[PDB]
Amino acid sequence: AQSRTLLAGIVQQQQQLLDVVKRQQELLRLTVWGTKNLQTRVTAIEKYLKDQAQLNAWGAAFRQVAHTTVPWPNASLTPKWNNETWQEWERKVDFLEENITALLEEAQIQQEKNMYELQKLNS
Amino acid sequence: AQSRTLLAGIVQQQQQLLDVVKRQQELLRLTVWGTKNLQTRVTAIEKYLKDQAQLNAWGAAFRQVAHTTVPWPNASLTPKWNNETWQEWERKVDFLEENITALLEEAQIQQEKNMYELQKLNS
Amino acid sequence: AQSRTLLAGIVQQQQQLLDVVKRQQELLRLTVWGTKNLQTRVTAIEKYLKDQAQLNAWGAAFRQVAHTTVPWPNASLTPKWNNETWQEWERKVDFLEENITALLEEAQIQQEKNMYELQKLNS
Numbered sequence: 268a269q270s271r272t273l274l275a276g277i278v279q280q281q282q283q284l285l286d287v288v289k290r291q292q293e294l295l296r297l298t299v300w301g302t303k304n305l306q307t308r309v310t311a312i313e314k315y316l317k318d319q320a321q322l323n324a325w326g327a328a329f330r331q332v333a334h335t336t337v338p339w340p341n342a343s344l345t346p347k348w349n350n351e352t353w354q355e356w357e358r359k360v361d362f363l364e365e366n367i368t369a370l371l372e373e374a375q376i377q378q379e380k381n382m383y384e385l386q387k388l389n390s
Numbered sequence: 391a392q393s394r395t396l397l398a399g400i401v402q403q404q405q406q407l408l409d410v411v412k413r414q415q416e417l418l419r420l421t422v423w424g425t426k427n428l429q430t431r432v433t434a435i436e437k438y439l440k441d442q443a444q445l446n447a448w449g450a451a452f453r454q455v456a457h458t459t460v461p462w463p464n465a466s467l468t469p470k471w472n473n474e475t476w477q478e479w480e481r482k483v484d485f486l487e488e489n490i491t492a493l494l495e496e497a498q499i500q501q502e503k504n505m506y507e508l509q510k511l512n513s
Numbered sequence: 514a515q516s517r518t519l520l521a522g523i524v525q526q527q528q529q530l531l532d533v534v535k536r537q538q539e540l541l542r543l544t545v546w547g548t549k550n551l552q553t554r555v556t557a558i559e560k561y562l563k564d565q566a567q568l569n570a571w572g573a574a575f576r577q578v579a580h581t582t583v584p585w586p587n588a589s590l591t592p593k594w595n596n597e598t599w600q601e602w603e604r605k606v607d608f609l610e611e612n613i614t615a616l617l618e619e620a621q622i623q624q625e626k627n628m629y630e631l632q633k634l635n636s
Contacts, residue, residue, distance in 0.1 A: 268392070269392075269514070269515075269516065270392065270394075270397070270511060271516075272507075273397065273504065273507055273508065273511070274516070274519065274523070276500060276503065276504045276507070277397070277400065277401065277404070277504055277523065278523065279500065280404055280497065280500055280501060280504060281404070281523070281526055281527070281530065283493055283496060283497045283500065284404065284407055284408065284411065284497065284530055285530065286493055287411055287490055287493045287494065287497070288411070288530065288533055288534070288537070290486050290489055290490045290493070291411070291414055291415075291418070291490070291537055292537075293486055294418060294483060294486045294487070294490075295418075295537070295540060295541075295544065297479055297482055297483050297486070298418065298421055298422060298425065298544055299544060299547075300479060301422075301425040301479065302425060302544065302547040302548060302551065304472075304476075304479075305425065305428055305429070305432070305551055306551070308432060308468070308472070309432075309551070309554060309555075309558075311466045312432075312435070312439070312465065312466075312558070315439065315463075315464045315465060315466065316439075316558070316561065316562075316565075318462070318464070319439075319442045319443075319464065319565045319568070320565075320568075322442070322443075322445070322446060322460070322462075322568070323568060323571050324447045324450055324570045324571040324572055324573055325446050325447040325450055325458040325460060326447055326450040326451055326454075326458045327447055327450040327570055327571055327572040327573040327574075328450075328572055328575060329451060329452075329453050329454060329575075330453065330575050330576065331572075331575060335571040335572045337568070337571060339564070339568075340561075341561045341564070341565065342558065342561060343557045343558075343561065345554075349550075349554070353550075356543055356546060356547065356550075359543055360540060360543050363536050363539055363540045363543070364540070366536055367533055367536045367537070367540075370529055370532055370533045370536070371533065373529060374526065374529050374530065374533070377522060377525065377526055377529065378526060380522065381519065381522045381523055381526060384518075384519055384522070385519065388516060388519070391515070392515075393515065393517075393520070393634060395630075396520065396627065396630055396631060396634070399623060399626065399627045399630065400520070400523065400524065400527070400627055402623065403527050403620065403623055403624060403627060404527070406616055406619060406620045406623065407527065407530055407531065407534065407620065409616055410534055410613055410616045410617065410620070411534070413609050413612055413613045413616070414534075414537055414538075414541070414613070416609055417541060417606060417609045417610070417613075418541075420602055420605055420606050420609070421541070421544055421545060421548065423602060424545075424548040424602065425548060427595075427599075427602075428548065428551055428552070428555070431555060431591070431595070432555075434589045435555075435558070435562070435588065435589075438562065438586075438587045438588060438589065439562075441585070441587070442562075442565045442566075442587065445565070445566075445568070445569060445583070445585075447570045447573055448569050448570040448573055448581040448583060449570055449573040449574055449577075449581045450570055450573040451573075452574060452575075452576050452577060453576065
C-alpha cells in the first residue's frame with residue numbers, strides 16, 4: 268500500500284526542475300556576453316572619438332605659415348577606478364558561478380541516488 | 391500511518407519552486423530588453439558621430455573660392471561580422487527559451503497529476 | 514517499512530534546489546549593474562559629444578574680426594520618452610523581485626516545517 272508510484276512522479280518532477288535551472292545558467296551566460304559585447308563596440312567608438320578631437324580647423328590659415336591643432340581629450344578612458352571596479356564585478360560572478368556548479372553536481376549525484384534507492388524498493 | 395500529509399507539503403513546495411523559476415524567466419526578459427535598448431541609444435549616437443566627421447572647418451577660407459570638407463568615417467558600423475554574430479546569439483536564446491517553456495509545460499502537467507493522484511489516495 | 518529515509522533525501526534535494534535559485538537571484542543583480550554601468554559610461558560620452566559640436570573652426574578668420582561657432586546638438590538626450598519607459602522597466606523588475614523574495618521566504622518556512630515534521634516521525 269506504499270505510494271512508491273507517487274514518489275516516482277515526485278522524484279521525476281525534481282529532475283525536470285533541475286534541468287530548467289541549468290537552462291537558466293546557459294541563458295545567463297548569453298546575456299553576459301551581450302553586456303561585454305556592448306563594451307567592445309564602445310571601445311571602437313572611443314578610438315574614433317579621439318580622432319574627432321584631432322579634427323579642429325583645416326586651411327584655417329591662408330595668410331600665415333602655421334596650423335592650429337587642438338586634440339583635446341574626447342573619450343574619458345577608465346584605467347583604475349572603473350576598470351578595477353569591473354574586475355570586482357566579474358570576480359563576484361565567478362564565485363557565484365562556481366557555487367552554482369558545485370550544488371548542481373551534488374544535486375545530480377543525490378538525484379541519481381534517490382532514484383537508485385527507489386528502484387531497489389521496487390526493482 | 392502513511393505520511394500523506396508530509397507529501398502534501400512536499401508537493402506544495404515543488405509548486406512554489408516552479409513559480410519562482412517562472413519569475414526568473416520574466417525577469418530575464420526585462421534584462422535582455424535593457425541590452426537591446428542600449429544598442430538603440432548607440433545607433434542614435436552613430437548618426438551624430440557621422441555628423442561630427444562632416445564638421446571640419448567653417449570659413450577657413452576668405453581669400454579663396456573653395457571650402458575644405460572632410461567627412462572621414464566616425465562610427466564603425468557592423469554590417470556582417472558583428473551583425474551576423476549577434477543573430478547567432480539571439481538564436482541561441484530562442485532555442486534555450488523554447489526548451490525552458492517546454493519543460494515548464496511538462497512540469498505543470500506532471501505537477502497537477504501528482505497532486506491529483508494524492509487527492510485520490512485521501513479524497 | 515515506511516521509506517522515511519528516502520523522503521529525507523528528497524527533502525534535502527529540494528533545499529539544494531532552493532539554494533541554487535537564490536544564487537541565480539544574486540547573479541542576476543550583478544548583470545543588472547553591468548547594464549546600468551554601461552549607461553554611466555554613455556552619459557560621460559554625451560558630455561564629450563556636446564564638446565565636439567562646440568569644435569567648429571579655429572582661426573578660420575585672419576582677415577575678419579569674427580569667429581564662427583557652431584555648437585549643433587550631438588548627443589540626443591532622452592528626457593521623457595526613453596527616460597519614462599526606462600522607469601517602467603525598473604518598476605517591473607521591482608514587482609517581480611518582491612514576488613520572488615516573498616515566495617523564497619514562504620519556501621524557507623515551509624521547507625523547515627517539512628523537515629521538522631519528518632523529524633517527529635523518526636525523532
